[model samples]
Each structure stands twice: as C-alpha cells, then as structure tokens.
Target: RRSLYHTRTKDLKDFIRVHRLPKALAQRMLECFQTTWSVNNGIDVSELLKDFPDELRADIAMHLNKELLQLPLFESASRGCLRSLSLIIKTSFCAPGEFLIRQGDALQAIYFVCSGSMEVLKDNTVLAILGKGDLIGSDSLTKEQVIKTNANVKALTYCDLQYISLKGLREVLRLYPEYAQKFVSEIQHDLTYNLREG
Candidate 1:
C-alpha cells in the first residue's frame, strides 16, 4: 500500500501536469501547500489528545503552544503556570471579514492571532490593525469584570487564532494559586500598559 504522503504528492503532480499553470505560480502553490502540510502531516491533535491524562495533555499542549507562551504577556511565566492555561486554550481559523470578537455578552473569550491580521473596530471605526502575536480582546485579562468598550474585531485575512474563555481561565488559574500568582502579576502589568496607552 502506498503511504498517504506518496499518494497525495502523486495526485497533485498528476493534477498539475494535466492542467498546467504558469511555472512560477505553480511553484508558489506547491510551497504554500508544503508550508501548511508540514505542521503535523495531517494528524488531528485534538482526537489524539482527547483521552490522554491531564499531565500528559498539559505537556503536549505546552509543547504545541511554544509560540503562544513566548508572547509578551507570558514572557516570564513559569512552565507550570503556562501549561494550566495552555491545556484549555485551543486554536481555530476564521475567514476574512469574519468577527473574531463580538461586541456583546456572548463573547467572553480572547484570541491571539497566530497568523494573518485583524482590525479592531469600535462598531464601525477601525481602532487598530493587529497582526500575528497580538491579543484580540481585553476581556480575557480579568475574571467576571464587566467590559464597557464597543470594541469588536474582523479578520483582514484568513487567520489562525489561539483562544480561551474567561470561564476556563478562571477555573484553571484557581487549581493552584501559587502558579497563578505568576500569571496574575503579568496581567496587572499589562493592564497598566493598556491603561497608559489611553
């Protein structure tokens, strides 16, 4: 039996050969496919990790979120503190012009843009354009705090995002207050940065 890798490559080659496109465009298409395909070779991480133990899941989640943990808000966080949050954070994508954060009570989640960019809008006016490595919502920084801004977000391009709800963050952070202390201070630090930006 031929492996999937071989089968897919052959299929693509056959398709491309039958309908020849410009050489430069063809090469760019192939490289784009390779870049996205190389991440896990089509393995579904959620299915594989679903039944695993929490410790193992934490380790695996942390490993996959190396890009996330390296963010400015998380820069000095301990691995243990980080894994608690990462264990609950999940990634998803949205189409261009789709809302990442809505201006309502329905959305209590914050998203970090893992790829592409999004524009923060106060209803209709663009407040800022946030790209990869930027956090998309301010609601994620605190527990049960009421948000008063009309801020919402729409993707400017297809976006890959890592996100977690405040509900999940609240519960997990309390699982160990010592670990949370490290994260708590970081939040306060960032809060001041945001307030000062006003």
Candidate 2:
C-alpha cells in the first residue's frame, strides 16, 4: 500500500529513536499518525506542509507565541489573548462551487476564512453570507457530536481557509489545560456574537 505520509516517515521515526518511548506507547502514537492519515484521505498533505518549515513547525509544536498576523481573526486583542498555545494549524484552498460543509456531515473542526466569499444555505434559502474575518463551523468547537445544519457552504469565489481540527486542539489542550479553557471560552464567545448578529 502507498504510504499516505511518506515524507514525514523518516522524521517521525527519528523522533521515536530520540524519545525512546515504551513499545506500547510508541505503537499507540504511530497509530494516531496512521489513523489521522486514513481519515483525511484526498488531503494533499505534502502541499499543506510545503510551507510549514522545520523552524515554524518546531515553534508551533512547542507552543511559542508566533503570530499569524495575516489572519483577520487575530485583529482583535481578545482573540489573540485566548490563543495562548501556538499550533501548527493547516490552511487549505477550495475552489468555487465546492460544498465547504455538507449538511449532516461530521464537523471535525472549526474553519475561518482568510479570503473569498461563501453563502450558507438551507432549504434553498440563504441563511448567511460570510467573507473575510468571519468564522465558519465555530459551533463544532463547543458542541458535542456532528453538525446541526442542513446548510451548504458554496464558495462564491475561490476560498482560502484556515482550520484547527478538534484533534489538534485536543493535543494542545493536553499540553496546557489553562489554554484549553481559554480557547474554549473564546470560541464560545465568538459563536454567541455571530449567532446574535445573524
């Protein structure tokens, strides 16, 4: 079988060599990698990691306060305050006409737009139109389980979106409990603000 993560294999293996984790624990973490890859089939991981160089990746992994200044979501001090632990979040591009979120889909993460426009639709009615500085799927972060919309998100134009998966957030939370609380609270506040505005 073709390895979904061929490029990172050597690096991850080297990590195992240096850490010397117990067999069971090492096996388990390896499973996390394999499982993550399996679940995210069709994701162009190499493309995603192309700019995530060693230095930046290390900084993010260590939870340093490297700023993603370009993101509008970070324009406010309150948002920045809550993002205490830096994470190597991934960004992806979706062409126009793609359904960004399918109704009944499992919302595994929260997404924010860096550029482009999209409309939220349900029953063929436009519920909301989102653009730069707006957050999509924020509800996934706070609620339990799958998404609750029969809504479709169609890109009005080609879109650039950044996302922090629930899986990645959990990893960060495990490392810093206080940051976890802050992150959750920030998302909660954002959700309230967005819904109220709508």
Candidate 3:
C-alpha cells in the first residue's frame, strides 16, 4: 500500500533537509526510495521473494528466467536442469555509469544481459557493446582455469542483469550433470558430422 511507504518518505525528506543536499539530489533520493516499494524494481530480485515459500519462490524465479534460458546456448537443457539453473540465478538492475565488472576483477560469477546495454573495454580499448543474450565472464567453466577478468563492463543505460556465482553453478550442475554433458555431446556431435562432410 502507498500508505506503508509514507513514513519512510517523510523520514527521508527530513534527512535531506538536514544534510543540505541540492534539490535535484534530494529528489533523486526520493525516487530511489519509491523504486524500492515496487516489486519489479530494486537492486535485486531475491529481496522480493525472500518471504515466499521455497517451492513457490523457485517457481517464480524459473518463470522469470524463461526468456534468458531460451537462448540457443541453453536450448539443449532438459527441464529439470533449467529449473535448477534458474533457481540459483539472481537478477538485478544497474544504473548508467555503474561498473558492472571492472578489468582485473575476479570472475567469481557469470552474468547475462537481460535488458539495456553495456560497453565492454579491454586494455582501455572498446571491445564491444553488449545487450540482451550476451554473457559476461563466460570465459571459463572449470575450476582449474584462471577466472580473472580482462575487460571492463559499464552500463550504458539502466540494465537488468541475471547472474549466478561459480559456486551456485557448480551446485546446480552437481545435481543435474546432464546439463553439462549435453553441451559437450552436441559439440562432439557437430565435430564428427562436420568432419565427415569435409
């Protein structure tokens, strides 16, 4: 209810007054506060679902992730594996100029661009502009591989990103190993068939 947020709005109004912020910044703060009241807005999706029952929460996350999982990279995923993958993935919104990933940052997670766009720079050179369906830090899937980032990814606009930590991905694959196996088989499937044709 709008009634519930009235108190918070009142409090921040006074806070900005005492802190002596400019009129524009004060309004920006208020806008940020209002965004929190929205279930579809905010920094991350998990906060909105924290109160839901376990199965219900997973179902919601799975439904929300359906579009991203439909990308051809995951087209071969079985239903169970998709369910598991979606459950661990986290979604968030970022503002323009926000450095989603900086060069030299450790690649502890893999990020997917859901909406909006980002610029990628490597060695201070523009590499690409990324948008929906692009993967960030997808360089390595093995623990033995160095997971250090080589590029900087900064949001060019308000962006919705979905990501899962390496640990989360490993946990999902442990239970649904076929998700990994299927990708491997398809690559080998194409290798042999293509070689035979050649």
Stretch of 10 with least lDDT, candidate 3: 189-198
Q: Which parts of model 1 have CA positions greater than 4 angstroms off?
A: 1-55, 58-62, 145-149, 179-182, 188-198
**Best to worst by TM-score, what's the order?**
3, 1, 2
Give the better candidate number (2 or 3) by TM-score: 3
Clash-forming residue pairs, model 3: none
Q: Local distance difference test, per candidate? A: 0.58, 0.54, 0.61
lDDT score for residue 75 of model 3: 73
Look at candidate 3 and tell me the lDDT of residue 94.
69
Displacement of residue 35 (Cα, Å) in model 2 is 26
Clashing pairs in 1: none
Residue range with the least summed lDDT across 10 consecutive positions in model 2: 38-47
lDDT of 3 by residue, 46-136 (tens): 3344467878866676556455465566777777777767766666676776667666655556667779988877776877888886666
For 1-198, candidate 1 gives per-residue lDDT tens digits of: 222233545667777788987788778867765444311122113334447887788768655644555666677656666776676666666567755555443445555677888777775788788887776445244455654335566678977777666566667677756656667566544331121112
Residue pairs clashing, model 2:
none
Candidate 2 at residue 20, lDDT? 83
Task: State every prediction's TM-score relative to the real structure.
Answer: 0.61, 0.55, 0.61
lDDT of 2 by residue, 60-164 (tens): 555543333234334443433334324445566665665666554555555667788888777578888888767765543543444444566667887776656
Select the stronger candidate by TM-score from 1 and 2: 1
